[PDB]
Swiss-Prot record:
<comment type="similarity">
    <text>Belongs to the DEFL family.</text>
</comment>
<keyword id="KW-0929">Antimicrobial</keyword>
<comment type="function">
    <text>Possesses antifungal activity sensitive to inorganic cations. Induces potential changes in fungal membranes and increased K(+) efflux and Ca(2+) uptake.</text>
</comment>
<keyword id="KW-1015">Disulfide bond</keyword>
<protein>
    <recommendedName>
        <fullName>Defensin-like protein 2</fullName>
    </recommendedName>
</protein>
<dbReference type="GO" id="GO:0031640">
    <property type="term" value="P:killing of cells of another organism"/>
</dbReference>
<dbReference type="GO" id="GO:0005576">
    <property type="term" value="C:extracellular region"/>
</dbReference>
<feature type="disulfide bond">
    <location>
        <begin position="25"/>
        <end position="47"/>
    </location>
</feature>
<keyword id="KW-0611">Plant defense</keyword>
<feature type="modified residue" description="Pyrrolidone carboxylic acid">
    <location>
        <position position="1"/>
    </location>
</feature>
<keyword id="KW-0964">Secreted</keyword>
<keyword id="KW-0873">Pyrrolidone carboxylic acid</keyword>
<dbReference type="GO" id="GO:0050832">
    <property type="term" value="P:defense response to fungus"/>
</dbReference>
<feature type="disulfide bond">
    <location>
        <begin position="15"/>
        <end position="36"/>
    </location>
</feature>
<feature type="disulfide bond">
    <location>
        <begin position="4"/>
        <end position="51"/>
    </location>
</feature>
<feature type="disulfide bond">
    <location>
        <begin position="21"/>
        <end position="45"/>
    </location>
</feature>
<keyword id="KW-0732">Signal</keyword>
Length: 51
């Protein structure tokens, strides 16, 4: 198991707080993790799934 990233699901916008959208992913789209991943040109909450 590692973490695979997936931006779309519950997230749409900017990455406000790591823990916030992490939890949001896990609750909504049911990810394992989620954080501000720096994709050009700005941090977005990318949800991390177990892969």
């Amino acid at each position: 198991q590692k973490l695979c990233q997936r931006p779309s699901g519950t997230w749409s916008g900017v990455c406000g707080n790591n823990n916030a959208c992490k939890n949001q992913c896990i609750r909504l789209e049911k990810a394992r993790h989620g954080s501000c991943n720096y994709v050009f040109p700005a941090h977005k909450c990318i949800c991390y799934f177990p892969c």
